[PDB]
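Why LIMONENE-1,2-EPOXIDE hydrolase? Reviewers of the renewal asked for a concrete example.
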Amino acid sequence: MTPLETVQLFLARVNALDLDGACALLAEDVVYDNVPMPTVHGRAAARAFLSQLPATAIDWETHAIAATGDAARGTVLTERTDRFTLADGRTLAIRVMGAFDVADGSITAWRDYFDLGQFMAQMAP
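Here is what the prediction returned.
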């Protein structure tokens, strides 16, 4: 898989509500950097972060995706709106751009860029 294909597969698996399978594509020691939040290290901790918000529906819209590098290694840039519905009916739509470093079909780092104030406002009941 190319870097681009790896990230497309990651995002598809998230959108298929398959968070385990999505996180399998993250390196065991992935650096997961939500830029305005504390950094998460490792696959297991990334998987835990992704389930801190209990969602019943998830739709991460990819507006644009493009990669640097070559067929084996590169950085994939994404422009997204991450939509989700929580158990309680809270609906969120977080505008975010993300950079994913990929080597040989594994995401070694994931850096997401968004405004935390907006995220918090949307989480407010």
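Helices lie at 3-15, 19-24, 43-50, 116-123. This is the kind of structural detail the renewal will allow us to pursue systematically.
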